[PDB]
Protein backbone atom coordinates (compact mmCIF):
# COMPACT_ATOMS: atom_id res chain seq x y z
CA UNK A 1 0.00 0.00 0.00
CA UNK A 2 3.09 2.34 -0.46
CA UNK A 3 2.29 5.17 -2.97
CA UNK A 4 4.38 5.89 -6.06
CA UNK A 5 4.87 9.26 -7.56
CA UNK A 6 4.64 9.51 -11.31
CA UNK A 7 6.57 12.13 -13.15
CA UNK A 8 4.85 13.55 -16.18
CA UNK A 9 5.50 16.43 -18.56
CA UNK A 10 2.71 18.14 -16.61
CA UNK A 11 3.40 17.57 -12.89
CA UNK A 12 3.95 14.92 -10.19
CA UNK A 13 0.94 12.67 -9.68
CA UNK A 14 0.30 9.89 -7.23
CA UNK A 15 -0.35 6.54 -8.82
CA UNK A 16 -3.57 4.83 -7.87
CA UNK A 17 -4.17 1.16 -7.18
CA UNK A 18 -7.78 1.04 -8.32
CA UNK A 19 -7.37 3.09 -11.48
CA UNK A 20 -5.19 1.73 -14.21
CA UNK A 21 -3.63 4.32 -16.40
CA UNK A 22 -2.99 2.85 -19.79
CA UNK A 23 -0.53 5.56 -20.83
CA UNK A 24 1.69 5.18 -17.74
CA UNK A 25 4.21 3.08 -19.55
CA UNK A 26 7.03 1.45 -17.68
CA UNK A 27 9.73 0.25 -20.05
CA UNK A 28 12.25 -1.14 -17.58
CA UNK A 29 13.03 -1.39 -13.92
CA UNK A 30 15.56 1.41 -14.34
CA UNK A 31 12.71 3.88 -14.41
CA UNK A 32 11.85 3.06 -10.80
CA UNK A 33 13.67 5.10 -8.19
CA UNK A 34 14.06 5.20 -4.39
CA UNK A 35 14.89 8.71 -3.14
CA UNK A 36 16.02 9.78 0.34
CA UNK A 37 15.12 13.39 1.25
CA UNK A 38 16.21 15.30 4.33
CA UNK A 39 13.89 16.77 6.96
CA UNK A 40 15.82 20.02 7.01
CA UNK A 41 14.23 20.85 3.66
CA UNK A 42 10.90 21.24 5.47
CA UNK A 43 12.25 23.77 7.97
CA UNK A 44 12.71 21.53 10.98
CA UNK A 45 15.10 22.99 13.53
CA UNK A 46 18.59 21.50 13.24
CA UNK A 47 20.44 22.79 16.32
CA UNK A 48 21.55 20.06 18.66
CA UNK A 49 19.36 21.12 21.66
CA UNK A 50 16.18 20.88 19.56
CA UNK A 51 17.16 17.91 17.43
CA UNK A 52 17.64 15.51 20.24
CA UNK A 53 14.15 16.17 21.52
CA UNK A 54 12.77 14.36 18.49
CA UNK A 55 14.56 11.13 19.41
CA UNK A 56 13.93 8.70 22.25
CA UNK A 57 14.42 5.20 23.53
CA UNK A 58 12.26 2.11 23.45
CA UNK A 59 12.42 -1.67 23.89
CA UNK A 60 10.36 -4.56 22.44
CA UNK A 61 10.59 -3.24 18.89
CA UNK A 62 13.34 -4.53 16.51
CA UNK A 63 15.20 -2.19 14.08
CA UNK A 64 14.71 -2.46 10.30
CA UNK A 65 16.19 -0.83 7.13
CA UNK A 66 15.36 -0.02 3.44
CA UNK A 67 17.56 1.13 0.56
CA UNK A 68 17.99 4.34 -1.49
CA UNK A 69 19.23 4.75 -4.94
CA UNK A 70 19.68 8.52 -4.66
CA UNK A 71 19.35 11.31 -2.15
CA UNK A 72 20.05 14.84 -0.92
CA UNK A 73 23.16 16.54 0.37
CA UNK A 74 22.67 17.41 4.00
CA UNK A 75 23.61 20.61 5.60
CA UNK A 76 23.35 19.05 9.04
CA UNK A 77 24.30 15.45 9.92
CA UNK A 78 24.63 13.96 13.37
CA UNK A 79 26.95 11.39 14.94
CA UNK A 80 26.25 10.03 18.43
CA UNK A 81 28.44 8.31 21.02
CA UNK A 82 26.33 8.06 24.15
CA UNK A 83 27.08 6.04 27.25
CA UNK A 84 25.12 5.17 30.34
CA UNK A 85 26.26 6.69 33.68
CA UNK A 86 27.91 3.35 34.52
CA UNK A 87 30.18 3.55 31.45
CA UNK A 88 28.33 1.00 29.26
CA UNK A 89 27.12 1.81 25.73
CA UNK A 90 23.56 3.11 24.84
CA UNK A 91 23.69 2.60 21.10
CA UNK A 92 24.49 -0.68 19.22
CA UNK A 93 27.46 -0.97 16.94
CA UNK A 94 26.56 -0.51 13.32
CA UNK A 95 26.33 -3.87 11.45
CA UNK A 96 28.28 -4.67 8.32
CA UNK A 97 27.19 -2.64 5.35
CA UNK A 98 26.14 0.42 7.31
CA UNK A 99 28.26 3.40 6.51
CA UNK A 100 27.82 7.08 7.22
CA UNK A 101 25.85 9.47 5.07
CA UNK A 102 28.22 10.46 2.15
CA UNK A 103 27.33 14.14 1.67
CA UNK A 104 27.13 16.20 4.92
CA UNK A 105 28.13 19.91 5.25
CA UNK A 106 28.36 20.12 9.08
CA UNK A 107 28.55 17.04 11.29
CA UNK A 108 27.40 17.46 14.83
CA UNK A 109 29.20 14.90 16.88
CA UNK A 110 27.76 14.48 20.31
CA UNK A 111 29.58 12.57 22.99
CA UNK A 112 28.33 12.18 26.46
CA UNK A 113 26.20 10.32 28.89
CA UNK A 114 22.62 10.01 30.00
CA UNK A 115 19.88 7.58 30.91
CA UNK A 116 19.04 5.25 27.99
CA UNK A 117 15.68 3.69 28.82
CA UNK A 118 15.31 1.28 25.90
CA UNK A 119 17.29 -0.97 23.62
CA UNK A 120 17.34 1.35 20.66
CA UNK A 121 16.88 4.99 19.90
CA UNK A 122 13.93 5.60 17.57
CA UNK A 123 12.64 8.66 15.79
CA UNK A 124 9.50 10.04 17.47
CA UNK A 125 7.83 11.36 14.34
CA UNK A 126 8.46 8.16 12.48
CA UNK A 127 11.17 9.66 10.29
CA UNK A 128 14.13 7.54 9.31
CA UNK A 129 17.76 7.90 10.11
CA UNK A 130 19.56 8.05 6.82
CA UNK A 131 22.80 6.13 6.46
CA UNK A 132 24.79 5.86 3.23
CA UNK A 133 22.14 4.25 1.03
CA UNK A 134 19.99 2.79 3.76
CA UNK A 135 17.25 4.32 5.85
CA UNK A 136 16.85 2.93 9.30
CA UNK A 137 14.41 3.05 12.08
CA UNK A 138 17.28 3.33 14.63
CA UNK A 139 20.47 5.16 15.52
CA UNK A 140 23.74 3.21 15.30
CA UNK A 141 26.71 4.09 17.47
CA UNK A 142 29.43 6.24 15.97
CA UNK A 143 27.81 6.50 12.55
CA UNK A 144 27.03 9.79 10.79
CA UNK A 145 23.40 10.18 9.68
CA UNK A 146 20.82 12.63 8.37
CA UNK A 147 17.16 12.70 9.36
CA UNK A 148 14.69 12.09 6.54
CA UNK A 149 11.97 10.39 4.54
CA UNK A 150 11.82 8.11 1.49
CA UNK A 151 9.88 8.58 -1.74
CA UNK A 152 9.30 6.00 -4.42
CA UNK A 153 8.53 6.95 -8.01
CA UNK A 154 8.45 6.44 -11.79
CA UNK A 155 11.03 8.81 -13.35
CA UNK A 156 10.06 9.68 -17.10
CA UNK A 157 32.70 18.15 6.37
CA UNK A 158 33.65 20.62 9.21
CA UNK A 159 32.93 18.37 12.27
CA UNK A 160 31.61 20.30 15.27
CA UNK A 161 32.01 18.55 18.62
CA UNK A 162 29.72 18.70 21.60
CA UNK A 163 29.64 17.25 25.07
CA UNK A 164 26.36 16.16 26.54
CA UNK A 165 24.94 15.39 29.92
CA UNK A 166 21.59 13.71 30.52
CA UNK A 167 21.39 12.93 26.83
CA UNK A 168 18.29 10.69 26.86
CA UNK A 169 16.03 12.86 29.09
CA UNK A 170 13.90 16.07 28.63
CA UNK A 171 16.18 18.45 30.68
CA UNK A 172 19.67 18.10 29.27
CA UNK A 173 22.69 20.30 28.79
CA UNK A 174 25.28 20.76 26.07
CA UNK A 175 28.73 22.29 25.63
CA UNK A 176 30.59 23.23 22.49
CA UNK A 177 34.11 21.89 22.52
CA UNK A 178 36.91 24.19 21.46
CA UNK A 179 39.72 22.22 23.06
CA UNK A 180 40.09 19.33 25.64
CA UNK A 181 39.81 21.90 28.49
CA UNK A 182 37.92 24.66 26.68
CA UNK A 183 34.15 24.79 26.30
CA UNK A 184 31.36 27.20 25.44
CA UNK A 185 27.85 26.89 26.84
CA UNK A 186 25.55 25.88 24.00
CA UNK A 187 22.30 27.62 23.12
CA UNK A 188 19.52 26.93 20.60
CA UNK A 189 20.10 30.35 19.06
CA UNK A 190 23.52 29.39 17.76
CA UNK A 191 24.00 28.34 14.16
CA UNK A 192 26.90 26.12 12.92
CA UNK A 193 28.49 29.17 11.37
CA UNK A 194 28.30 31.03 14.64
CA UNK A 195 30.08 28.26 16.44
CA UNK A 196 32.82 28.17 13.85
CA UNK A 197 33.31 31.91 14.21
CA UNK A 198 33.58 31.59 17.96
CA UNK A 199 36.09 28.70 17.59
CA UNK A 200 38.33 30.95 15.39
CA UNK A 201 38.33 34.00 17.60
CA UNK A 202 38.82 32.07 20.82
CA UNK A 203 41.42 29.71 19.54
CA UNK A 204 43.32 32.35 17.51
CA UNK A 205 43.40 34.86 20.35
CA UNK A 206 44.58 32.26 22.86
CA UNK A 207 41.55 32.59 25.16
CA UNK A 208 41.85 28.94 26.11
CA UNK A 209 42.74 27.06 29.21
CA UNK A 210 46.53 27.15 30.11
CA UNK A 211 46.15 25.45 33.60
CA UNK A 212 44.78 21.96 34.03
CA UNK A 213 41.27 23.22 34.77
CA UNK A 214 38.37 23.53 32.36
CA UNK A 215 37.62 26.98 31.09
CA UNK A 216 33.92 27.42 30.48
CA UNK A 217 32.71 30.34 28.40
CA UNK A 218 29.34 31.96 28.41
CA UNK A 219 28.25 34.00 25.44
CA UNK A 220 27.12 37.50 26.13
CA UNK A 221 23.24 37.30 26.12
CA UNK A 222 23.11 40.10 23.41
Amino acid sequence: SIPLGVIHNSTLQVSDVDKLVCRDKLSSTNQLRSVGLNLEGNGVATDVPSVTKRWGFRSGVPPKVVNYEAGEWAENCYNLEIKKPDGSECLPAAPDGIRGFPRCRYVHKVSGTGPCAGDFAFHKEGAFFLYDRLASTVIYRGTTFAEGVVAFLILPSTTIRYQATGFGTNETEYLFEVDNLTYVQLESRFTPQFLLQLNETIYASGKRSNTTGKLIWKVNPE
Epitope: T165, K207, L215, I216, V219
Partner: antibody, heavy 136, light 107 residues
Protein backbone atom coordinates in the same frame (compact mmCIF):
# COMPACT_ATOMS: atom_id res chain seq x y z
CA UNK B 1 34.21 35.85 43.51
CA UNK B 2 33.05 32.29 44.61
CA UNK B 3 31.99 31.63 48.21
CA UNK B 4 30.62 28.60 50.01
CA UNK B 5 29.39 28.39 53.61
CA UNK B 6 29.13 25.30 55.84
CA UNK B 7 26.31 24.44 58.25
CA UNK B 8 24.59 21.44 59.87
CA UNK B 9 27.29 20.78 62.51
CA UNK B 10 27.27 20.78 66.33
CA UNK B 11 27.06 17.92 68.84
CA UNK B 12 26.12 14.39 67.83
CA UNK B 13 26.56 11.20 69.84
CA UNK B 14 28.94 8.40 68.65
CA UNK B 15 27.13 5.53 67.06
CA UNK B 16 24.81 8.05 65.39
CA UNK B 17 24.92 10.08 62.21
CA UNK B 18 24.47 13.57 60.80
CA UNK B 19 24.39 15.40 57.51
CA UNK B 20 26.38 18.57 56.94
CA UNK B 21 25.63 21.05 54.24
CA UNK B 22 27.50 23.86 52.39
CA UNK B 23 25.60 26.37 50.28
CA UNK B 24 27.31 28.76 47.96
CA UNK B 25 27.08 31.49 45.34
CA UNK B 26 29.29 33.54 42.96
CA UNK B 27 29.77 30.68 40.51
CA UNK B 28 27.81 29.55 37.45
CA UNK B 29 25.86 26.88 39.28
CA UNK B 30 27.58 24.01 41.04
CA UNK B 31 26.12 21.06 39.17
CA UNK B 32 27.06 21.45 35.53
CA UNK B 33 29.81 23.59 34.04
CA UNK B 34 31.42 23.62 37.42
CA UNK B 35 34.10 22.22 39.64
CA UNK B 36 33.30 19.22 41.73
CA UNK B 37 33.40 19.77 45.46
CA UNK B 38 35.24 18.27 48.34
CA UNK B 39 35.09 17.91 52.03
CA UNK B 40 38.22 18.26 54.13
CA UNK B 41 38.39 18.10 57.90
CA UNK B 42 40.79 19.43 60.42
CA UNK B 43 40.70 18.41 64.03
CA UNK B 44 42.06 21.15 66.31
CA UNK B 45 45.82 20.61 66.62
CA UNK B 46 45.93 18.52 63.42
CA UNK B 47 46.48 19.26 59.72
CA UNK B 48 43.73 18.92 57.04
CA UNK B 49 42.48 15.50 55.97
CA UNK B 50 40.82 14.77 52.65
CA UNK B 51 37.36 13.17 52.98
CA UNK B 52 36.23 12.97 49.40
CA UNK B 53 34.75 14.86 46.47
CA UNK B 54 31.71 14.82 44.24
CA UNK B 55 32.45 15.41 40.61
CA UNK B 56 30.39 17.69 38.48
CA UNK B 57 27.81 16.07 36.26
CA UNK B 58 29.69 16.95 33.10
CA UNK B 59 32.59 14.94 34.57
CA UNK B 60 30.30 11.98 35.50
CA UNK B 61 28.85 12.96 38.93
CA UNK B 62 30.77 10.30 40.92
CA UNK B 63 32.41 10.47 44.33
CA UNK B 64 36.09 9.80 45.00
CA UNK B 65 36.74 8.96 48.66
CA UNK B 66 39.66 9.17 51.02
CA UNK B 67 40.55 5.84 52.61
CA UNK B 68 39.74 6.92 56.28
CA UNK B 69 36.09 7.54 55.52
CA UNK B 70 35.35 4.70 53.15
CA UNK B 71 32.10 2.91 53.90
CA UNK B 72 31.16 5.54 56.51
CA UNK B 73 30.92 8.93 54.88
CA UNK B 74 29.00 9.86 51.73
CA UNK B 75 29.59 12.98 49.62
CA UNK B 76 26.59 14.12 47.57
CA UNK B 77 25.02 17.26 46.08
CA UNK B 78 21.62 18.91 45.76
CA UNK B 79 21.70 19.67 42.08
CA UNK B 80 20.84 23.23 41.06
CA UNK B 81 20.49 24.29 44.72
CA UNK B 82 24.20 24.92 44.81
CA UNK B 83 24.48 22.85 47.95
CA UNK B 84 27.02 20.28 48.94
CA UNK B 85 26.26 17.66 51.57
CA UNK B 86 28.24 15.22 53.72
CA UNK B 87 26.48 12.28 55.31
CA UNK B 88 28.55 10.90 58.14
CA UNK B 89 27.47 7.57 59.50
CA UNK B 90 28.88 5.24 62.16
CA UNK B 91 30.26 8.19 64.06
CA UNK B 92 33.14 7.76 66.42
CA UNK B 93 34.65 10.36 68.76
CA UNK B 94 37.73 10.35 66.49
CA UNK B 95 35.55 12.24 63.98
CA UNK B 96 35.46 15.41 66.04
CA UNK B 97 36.86 17.99 63.64
CA UNK B 98 36.17 21.18 61.80
CA UNK B 99 34.54 20.19 58.53
CA UNK B 100 35.17 22.31 55.51
CA UNK B 101 33.73 22.39 51.99
CA UNK B 102 36.19 23.30 49.30
CA UNK B 103 35.98 24.36 45.68
CA UNK B 104 38.26 24.32 42.66
CA UNK B 105 36.80 27.48 41.15
CA UNK B 106 37.20 31.18 40.45
CA UNK B 107 36.70 33.50 37.49
CA UNK B 108 38.81 33.29 34.31
CA UNK B 109 39.55 35.79 31.46
CA UNK B 110 36.82 37.68 29.65
CA UNK B 111 36.48 38.59 25.99
CA UNK B 112 34.24 40.92 23.93
CA UNK B 113 32.46 37.67 23.24
CA UNK B 114 31.44 36.71 26.80
CA UNK B 115 32.46 35.76 30.38
CA UNK B 116 34.44 32.79 31.69
CA UNK B 117 35.30 30.63 34.75
CA UNK B 118 37.88 27.92 35.50
CA UNK B 119 37.21 24.61 37.14
CA UNK B 120 40.20 23.02 38.82
CA UNK B 121 41.55 19.79 40.26
CA UNK B 122 42.78 21.70 43.38
CA UNK B 123 41.24 24.15 45.82
CA UNK B 124 41.07 27.93 45.57
CA UNK B 125 38.01 28.51 47.69
CA UNK B 126 37.58 27.31 51.22
CA UNK B 127 34.52 27.72 53.38
CA UNK B 128 34.65 28.79 57.04
CA UNK B 129 34.34 25.29 58.47
CA UNK B 130 31.55 23.86 60.64
CA UNK B 131 32.58 22.20 63.86
CA UNK B 132 31.26 18.72 64.42
CA UNK B 133 31.61 17.26 67.85
CA UNK B 134 31.19 13.61 68.47
CA UNK B 135 31.05 12.75 72.16
CA UNK B 136 29.31 10.66 74.93
CA UNK C 1 49.48 4.70 48.74
CA UNK C 2 51.18 8.02 47.76
CA UNK C 3 51.96 9.74 51.06
CA UNK C 4 53.58 13.12 51.80
CA UNK C 5 56.15 13.63 54.55
CA UNK C 6 57.57 17.07 55.42
CA UNK C 7 61.01 17.96 56.73
CA UNK C 8 62.15 19.77 58.90
CA UNK C 9 59.22 19.61 61.35
CA UNK C 10 60.07 23.17 62.42
CA UNK C 11 62.01 25.84 60.57
CA UNK C 12 63.84 28.52 62.52
CA UNK C 13 64.95 31.74 60.89
CA UNK C 14 65.00 35.47 61.47
CA UNK C 15 62.68 37.46 59.17
CA UNK C 16 64.59 38.55 56.08
CA UNK C 17 66.46 35.22 55.89
CA UNK C 18 65.74 32.60 53.19
CA UNK C 19 63.64 29.55 54.05
CA UNK C 20 63.04 26.19 52.46
CA UNK C 21 60.76 23.30 53.26
CA UNK C 22 60.76 19.98 51.48
CA UNK C 23 58.27 17.06 51.06
CA UNK C 24 59.06 13.54 50.08
CA UNK C 25 56.39 11.48 48.45
CA UNK C 26 56.23 7.71 48.78
CA UNK C 27 55.49 7.60 45.03
CA UNK C 28 56.83 9.53 42.03
CA UNK C 29 54.54 12.24 40.72
CA UNK C 30 54.44 14.67 37.78
CA UNK C 31 54.85 18.39 38.51
CA UNK C 32 51.37 19.38 37.43
CA UNK C 33 49.82 17.52 40.35
CA UNK C 34 51.54 19.29 43.28
CA UNK C 35 50.56 22.16 45.61
CA UNK C 36 51.47 23.79 48.92
CA UNK C 37 49.15 25.58 51.34
CA UNK C 38 49.65 28.34 53.96
CA UNK C 39 47.68 28.22 57.21
CA UNK C 40 47.24 30.54 60.13
CA UNK C 41 44.96 29.89 63.15
CA UNK C 42 41.38 30.87 62.40
CA UNK C 43 41.87 30.58 58.64
CA UNK C 44 41.43 27.90 56.00
CA UNK C 45 44.80 27.29 54.18
CA UNK C 46 45.69 29.61 51.27
CA UNK C 47 46.66 28.01 47.97
CA UNK C 48 50.07 29.74 47.40
CA UNK C 49 51.36 27.46 44.61
CA UNK C 50 49.98 24.69 42.41
CA UNK C 51 51.29 22.49 39.64
CA UNK C 52 54.61 22.45 41.55
CA UNK C 53 55.87 25.71 39.99
CA UNK C 54 52.75 27.77 39.04
CA UNK C 55 51.85 30.51 41.47
CA UNK C 56 48.35 30.94 42.76
CA UNK C 57 47.13 34.46 42.26
CA UNK C 58 47.15 36.93 45.15
CA UNK C 59 50.54 35.46 46.15
CA UNK C 60 53.87 37.41 46.32
CA UNK C 61 56.77 36.50 44.01
CA UNK C 62 58.93 35.60 46.97
CA UNK C 63 57.04 32.28 47.10
CA UNK C 64 58.29 29.78 44.53
CA UNK C 65 57.86 26.03 44.24
CA UNK C 66 60.05 23.45 42.51
CA UNK C 67 60.68 19.70 42.28
CA UNK C 68 60.16 16.41 40.45
CA UNK C 69 59.79 12.70 41.10
CA UNK C 70 59.31 12.29 44.82
CA UNK C 71 61.06 15.44 46.00
CA UNK C 72 59.39 18.83 46.13
CA UNK C 73 60.32 22.12 47.81
CA UNK C 74 58.80 25.48 48.64
CA UNK C 75 61.29 28.31 48.77
CA UNK C 76 60.60 31.67 50.25
CA UNK C 77 63.38 33.97 49.03
CA UNK C 78 63.08 36.18 52.12
CA UNK C 79 60.74 35.10 54.82
CA UNK C 80 58.68 38.03 56.10
CA UNK C 81 57.09 38.17 59.65
CA UNK C 82 53.68 37.71 57.99
CA UNK C 83 54.84 34.48 56.37
CA UNK C 84 55.56 32.59 59.61
CA UNK C 85 52.66 30.18 59.06
CA UNK C 86 52.17 26.43 59.00
CA UNK C 87 52.87 25.00 55.59
CA UNK C 88 51.41 21.88 54.04
CA UNK C 89 52.07 19.84 50.84
CA UNK C 90 49.34 18.45 48.70
CA UNK C 91 49.19 16.12 45.77
CA UNK C 92 46.40 15.24 43.37
CA UNK C 93 47.65 11.83 42.09
CA UNK C 94 45.29 12.09 39.12
CA UNK C 95 42.50 10.87 41.52
CA UNK C 96 43.06 10.36 45.38
CA UNK C 97 44.18 13.40 47.30
CA UNK C 98 46.90 13.59 49.96
CA UNK C 99 47.92 16.35 52.45
CA UNK C 100 51.27 16.65 54.34
CA UNK C 101 51.36 16.71 58.16
CA UNK C 102 52.00 20.46 58.65
CA UNK C 103 55.30 22.21 59.27
CA UNK C 104 55.72 25.17 61.52
CA UNK C 105 57.87 28.11 60.60
CA UNK C 106 59.17 30.17 63.56
CA UNK C 107 61.48 33.22 64.17
Amino acid sequence: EVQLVESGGGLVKPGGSLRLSCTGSGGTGFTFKYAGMSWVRQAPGKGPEWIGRIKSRIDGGTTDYAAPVKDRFIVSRDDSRNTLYLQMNSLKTEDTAVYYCATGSGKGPSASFGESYYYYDFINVWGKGTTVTVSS
Amino acid sequence: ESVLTQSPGTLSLSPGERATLSCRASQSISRKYLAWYQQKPGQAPRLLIYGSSSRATGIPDRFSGSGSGTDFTLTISRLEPEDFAVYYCHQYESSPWTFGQGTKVEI
